[PDB]
Symmetry: C3
Subunit: 102 residues, 3 copies
Amino acid sequence: MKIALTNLPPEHGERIARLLVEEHIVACVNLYPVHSIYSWKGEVCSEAEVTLMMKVSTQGIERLKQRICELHPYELPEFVVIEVDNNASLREYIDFVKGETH
Amino acid sequence: MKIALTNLPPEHGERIARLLVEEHIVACVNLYPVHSIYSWKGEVCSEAEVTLMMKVSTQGIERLKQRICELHPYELPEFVVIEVDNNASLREYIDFVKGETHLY
Amino acid sequence: MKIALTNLPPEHGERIARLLVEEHIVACVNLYPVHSIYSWKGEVCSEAEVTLMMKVSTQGIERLKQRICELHPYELPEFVVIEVDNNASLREYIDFVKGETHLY
């Protein structure tokens, strides 16, 4: 499995999370409100967002990335994949994540 | 060192985080409240949880895993280990983590 | 790119995050309040902190680490780098992060 992250404006965040799960694109999404500060075209932006932390099979990462790009309201969406130590993780959990990612 | 994550109901998250630190199974736990949406046995579940981000020596990961499974209320607990770049991380911090984690 | 994490007291977290972005030492920081429980010199400590999740180019990681050590108010600052799968991540996003991180 791997973990992927995106930041979304708050309303879109909850809606898109639900859709990724309903479509079995991801097994689980954890949503955290965040304050994001970032550079964009010579401006410093300070925004209310929500972080989606998405748990998905390794094989399903491409499908997630494509669906995120279809749904994401931003011209340049965040999509960052974090490496999981699959051996050290609980094997029954990684299998669950694999099984729910259709 | 590595980082391990689990989600727990808020009734248990704070208690278990404390116990892991008191028993020197982990050096440090960060707790974040979270809304979790997940697929379970044909249903979409929407729950209040707390995420434990646990910092532990690489060698102590197995002991952590075992203790999480003993304590976790869920039939299928989340236990996901994230890869740390030990070279790029601050060595003094990695050594702190290692020193607080007791191996047996 | 990589992701780096540090925890700061809330009276410094927002200030440092803003500085790191203004100076182009990172492209983006996400800030999350956290409850930290940790082991320190035989005591269990329970603190209010803020986690900074910093997105930075791979080549700017060293400069970030140094800047964090200059600014951090703890005697032993946290700085943990988590491994990003750059190929699986969105290429346009990783290019954005690279472009907004200035080494010089």
